[PDB]
Amino acid sequence: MSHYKSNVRDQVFNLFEVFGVDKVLGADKFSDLDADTAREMLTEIARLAEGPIAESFVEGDRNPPVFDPETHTVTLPEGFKKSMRALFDGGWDKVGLAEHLGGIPMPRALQWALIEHILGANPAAYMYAMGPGMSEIFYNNGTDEQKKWATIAAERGWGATMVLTEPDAGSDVGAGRTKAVQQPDGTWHIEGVKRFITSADSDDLFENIMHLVLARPEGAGPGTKGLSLFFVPKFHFDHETGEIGERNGVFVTNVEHKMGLKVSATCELSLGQHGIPAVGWLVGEVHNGIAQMFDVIEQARMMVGTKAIATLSTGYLNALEYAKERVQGADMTQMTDKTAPRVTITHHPDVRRSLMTQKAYAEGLRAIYLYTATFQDAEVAQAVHGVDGDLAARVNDLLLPIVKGFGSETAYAKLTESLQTLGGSGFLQDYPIEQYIRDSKIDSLYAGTTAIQAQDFFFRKIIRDKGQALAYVAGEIEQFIKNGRLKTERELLATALADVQGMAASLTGYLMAAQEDAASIYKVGLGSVRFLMAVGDLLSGWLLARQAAVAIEKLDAGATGADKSFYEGKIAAASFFAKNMLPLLTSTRQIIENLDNDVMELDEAAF
Ligand X SMILES: CCCCCCCC(=O)SCCNC(=O)CCNC(=O)[C@H](O)C(C)(C)COP(=O)(O)OP(=O)(O)OC[C@H]1O[C@@H](n2cnc3c(N)ncnc32)[C@H](O)[C@@H]1OP(=O)(O)O
Q: Which of 424, 475, 558, 561 binds ligand FAD (CB under 6 A)?
A: 424
Cα torsion at 484, 490, 491, 496 (round to 10°)? Answer: 170
Residue 525's contacts (CB-CB under 8 Å, 6 or more residues apart) are 451, 455
332 binds ligand X (CB under 6 A): no
Measured from the CB atom, the residue of 106 and 125 that comes closer to ligand FAD is 125
Measured from the CB atom, the residue of 143 and 346 that comes closer to a copy of itself is 346
326 binds ligand FAD (CB under 6 A): yes
Q: Are 125 and 87 in contact (CB under 8 A)?
A: yes
State the binding string over 186-225 for ligand FAD (x if CB under 6 A, else -). Answer: ----------xxx---------------------------
396 binds ligand X (CB under 6 A): no
Measured from the CB atom, the residue of 451 and 514 that comes closer to ligand FAD is 451
- To a copy of itself, the closest distance from the beta carbon of 298 in angstroms equals 19
Q: Please tell me the distance from the alpha carbon of residue 46 to that of residue 161, in angstroms, as a whole number.
A: 26
84 binds ligand X (CB under 6 A): no
Letter for the amino acid at 134? Answer: M
328 binds ligand FAD (CB under 6 A): yes
Measured from the CB atom, the residue of 55 and 456 that comes closer to ligand X is 456
457 binds ligand FAD (CB under 6 A): no
Q: Please tell me the distance from the alpha carbon of residue 425 to that of residue 22, in angstroms, as a whole number.
A: 42
Letter for the amino acid at 577? Answer: F
90 binds ligand FAD (CB under 6 A): no
165-168 contacts: CB < 8 A, separation 24 or more?
Answer: 165/194, 165/195, 165/196, 165/197, 166/192, 166/193, 166/194, 166/195, 167/193, 167/195
3-state SS, residue 72: coil
Measured from the CB atom, the residue of 355 and 373 that comes closer to a copy of itself is 355
297 binds ligand X (CB under 6 A): yes
Measured from the CB atom, the residue of 347 and 554 that comes closer to ligand X is 347
Count of residues engaged in binding ligand X, rule: CB under 6 A: 26
448 binds ligand X (CB under 6 A): yes
Q: Please tell me the distance from the alpha carbon of residue 227 to that of residue 221, in angstroms, as a whole number.
A: 8
Q: Are 564 and 552 in contact (CB under 8 A)?
A: no
Measured from the CB atom, the residue of 423 and 583 that comes closer to ligand FAD is 423
524 binds ligand FAD (CB under 6 A): no
Where the chain is broken, by preceding residue (C–N > 2.5 Å)? 483
Q: Please tell me the distance from the alpha carbon of residue 49 to that of residue 53, in angstroms, as a whole number.
A: 5
- To ligand FAD, the closest distance from the beta carbon of 124 in angstroms equals 10
442 binds ligand X (CB under 6 A): no
**CA-to-CA separations, 1 to 47, 167, 234, 507, in angstroms, rounded:** 11, 42, 38, 50
92-123 burial, b at 16+ Cβ within 10 Å, e below that, comes to bbbbbbbeebebbbbbbbbbbbbbbbbbbbbb
Q: Are strands 228-233 and 278-282 parallel, antiparallel or unpaired?
A: antiparallel
| Residues from 125 through 184 that contact ligand X (CB under 6 A) | 127, 130, 161-162, 164-165, 171, 173-174
Q: Which of 37, 346, 382, 420 binds ligand FAD (CB under 6 A)?
A: 420
- Residue 451 exposure: Cα atoms within 13 Å on the Cβ side: 7
Residue 221's contacts (CB-CB under 8 Å, 6 or more residues apart) are none
- To a copy of itself, the closest distance from the beta carbon of 84 in angstroms equals 23
Q: Which of 56, 178, 224, 421 binds ligand X (CB under 6 A)?
A: 224
**Residue 507 CB burial class (10 angstroms; 0-12, 13-18, ≥19):** buried
Q: Which of 192, 315, 448, 502 binds ligand FAD (CB under 6 A)?
A: 448
Q: What, of a copy of itself, ligand FAD, ligand X, none, does residue 130 touch, CB below 5 to 8 Å by kind?
A: ligand X
Q: Which of 110, 210, 282, 300 binds ligand X (CB under 6 A)?
A: 300
Helix (H) or strand (E) holding 73: strand 73-75
- To ligand X, the closest distance from the beta carbon of 40 in angstroms equals 28
Q: What, of a copy of itself, ligand FAD, ligand X, none, does residue 583 touch, CB below 5 to 8 Å by kind?
A: a copy of itself
- To a copy of itself, the closest distance from the beta carbon of 245 in angstroms equals 34
Q: What, of ligand FAD, ligand X, a copy of itself, none, does residue 456 touch, CB below 5 to 8 Å by kind?
A: ligand X
Q: Please tell me the distance from the alpha carbon of residue 224 to that of residue 216, in angstroms, as a whole number.
A: 9
Q: Are 597 and 519 in contact (CB under 8 A)?
A: yes
- To ligand FAD, the closest distance from the beta carbon of 170 in angstroms equals 2
Measured from the CB atom, the residue of 96 and 159 that comes closer to ligand FAD is 159
344 binds ligand FAD (CB under 6 A): no
| Residues from 452 through 481 that contact ligand X (CB under 6 A) | 452, 456, 460
Residue 225's contacts (CB-CB under 8 Å, 6 or more residues apart) are 174, 290
How many residues are present in the chain? Answer: 607
What are the residues binding ligand FAD (CB under 6 A)? 161-165, 170-171, 196-198, 258, 261, 266, 326, 328-329, 345, 348, 350-351, 420-421, 423-425, 427, 442, 445-446, 448-449, 451
Residues of the shown chain interacting with ligand X in the complex, contacts defined by CB under 6 A: 127, 130, 161-162, 164-165, 171, 173-174, 198-199, 223-224, 290-291, 294, 297-298, 300, 338, 446-448, 452, 456, 460
